[PDB]
Amino acid sequence: MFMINILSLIIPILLAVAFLTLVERKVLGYMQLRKGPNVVGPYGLLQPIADALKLVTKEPLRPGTSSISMFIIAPILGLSLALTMWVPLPMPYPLINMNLGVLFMLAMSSLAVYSILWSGWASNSKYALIGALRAVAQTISYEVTLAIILLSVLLMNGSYTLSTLITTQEHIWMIFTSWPLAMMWFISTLAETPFAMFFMAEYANIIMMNAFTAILFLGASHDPHTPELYTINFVLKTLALTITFLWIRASYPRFRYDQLMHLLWKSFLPLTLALCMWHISLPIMTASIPPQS
Amino acid sequence: LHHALIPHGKGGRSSVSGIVATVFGATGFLGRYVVNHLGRMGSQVIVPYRCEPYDTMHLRPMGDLGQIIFMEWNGKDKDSIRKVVEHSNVVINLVGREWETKNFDFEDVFVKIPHAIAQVSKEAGVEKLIHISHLNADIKSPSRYLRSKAVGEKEVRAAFPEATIIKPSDIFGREDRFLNYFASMRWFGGVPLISLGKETVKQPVYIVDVSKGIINAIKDPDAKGKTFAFVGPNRYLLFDLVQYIFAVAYRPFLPYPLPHFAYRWVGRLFEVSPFEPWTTRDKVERVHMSDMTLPHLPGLEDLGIQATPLELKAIEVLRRHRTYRWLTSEMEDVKPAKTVNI
């Protein structure tokens, strides 16, 4: 029945990808004195169905100067990635308990840059070429802060096994030991994230990033007998983070590129190095090095 | 003439030309171009559209306000015909279905309907009729197209003795269903032209001359009763055109002498799709049938219209087919395709 478990994950995540959009528009709506989708079905419950089947009935126009092969495989990778990093999440018990789950999460999430890079190239337009160039450099700039934060975070965890994160936190949320890193981590997650697909690809990244941040910094207690306790806690924590993720979507003017690079390489990277230096010696400092096994 | 029908104005949109057209089946390859030319001097078009108005919406911006009067009708309803042409100086018919449908058999679109409008329009009191008939149509052809058009042509001419009949040879244009049809071989594998296609000659004509002929036929008094044949100024063996247009598109020309009996079944296999079939068994041999050069039939030059050669009026339609690899190119490039020139 293991295959059934995959569909018991991919589809609801796909629906979860579908259904937080109404949350977004109504949160973004009610924020600006507005109402959000509330006329199509009760409180816009059927609004996601109101757009999806319309989109699939819309003809997918293709640019004349577009390489079809790349134009159709770039979304293939984009969706394939966006629904793959959901598999090793230590949600109650992960589908895959890869001993190197954190590395697998990073390598495969850093692969998303290919989709946007190919989309700009395959589209073959002046707008698409720069937009791909801007998006990728913004993205490829920000794994170095991503990797260091996660690396330095995991010194006090014990290994890259994502299931071990629960044991590490247990007593207190792990933010209380690395809250300078949490703001370091959370901000970096904002910027790293056919056309019908591209909704799904980046969007699962939005929730999973917050799901990834949820387990990493704000853990829960996984009772061996009853697993529903971790389920509710995990969902509630990743909902609060995502609401915050859209809380800041309509609360700041968007970053400009020169500051976007300046913010990292001159005010985020050097501080990330110091915290990593702080969190590499502190387990040694207090003889609190964790067990890998 | 009727008091509110005297031609006025210099031929602008808000100038009453006098012609009161009732073009049938304007939502087609030729209907759009003719209704534009009829709308370009101020003729109140009374087209019965039948499909969704959305597909007929693009006909709105080719006429003054209150000129293109869309009307509802049914092909199998005489009363529908009677209403639309009740008050019309002329009635123009282009009802044509290139493929075979379940609801309309091929004779339904070319025997019943073309004659089903002539007698009632005469009953209503029309003054003209420009029902067209394919030039290549033959009574004893193996294609249902050429048989059906011929038998319907005599009925409409007999029922309406003044019904001018236009004989277009091959109306090429933006979506003529030949040039893009010839371009369509790229996805469908090797070009399945039978016997390498060394035994068939076509004479195509650029569409807007044909529409120019139709309006000219409208204002020309001699058109009544006569039959006009509309052909281009040069003719080609079909192996030239397929090599030609592939070279104008700069696509790799990939001919293949597929046997005749194979394409006969494949044509109906293309028709298996419930939606618009890509290729029909009626068109499999319609391509391979050559053109006649009947001299007694008056042509465009006699009607006062010069015929543009296909070479010049090709880059417009062709540019859609070519990809980026030679999109920036211009005319010439491709060799001037060799004509056999009768």
Ligand SMILES: CCCCCCCCCCCCCCCCCC(=O)OC[C@H](COP(=O)([O-])OCC[N+](C)(C)C)OC(=O)CCCCCCCCCCCCCCCCC
């Ligand atoms: C014993 C103690 C050991 C550890 C001590 C650690 C050092 C002491 C604490 C240091 C400061 C706190 C940690 C680092 C924070 C970032 C530092 C930094 O560069 O700031 C200035 C930076 C840059 O500010 P700037 O660009 O104006 O100025 C920087 C300095 N110059 C001018 C020289 C370049 O601030 C930002 O980047 C602004 C925010 C950008 C993102 C926009 C959205 C913000 C959303 C905020 C609300 C949500 C927060 C969620 C938090 C996580 C929740 C799970």
Ligand SMILES: NC(=O)C1=CN([C@@H]2O[C@H](COP(=O)(O)OP(=O)(O)OC[C@H]3O[C@@H](n4cnc5c(N)ncnc54)[C@H](OP(=O)(O)O)[C@@H]3O)[C@@H](O)[C@H]2O)C=CC1
């Ligand atoms: N390549 C070609 O198209 C060639 C065409 N011809 C002939 O010249 C004329 C071209 O007309 P054009 O408009 O360009 O052709 P199209 O096939 O592009 O469009 C035909 C038009 O007539 C309507 N129509 C066709 N059959 C019926 C029917 N049975 N009942 C109701 N409406 C119908 C169509 O409705 P809808 O839009 O809904 O389909 C459309 O408005 C026709 O007589 C055609 O047979 C001759 C040689 C080649």
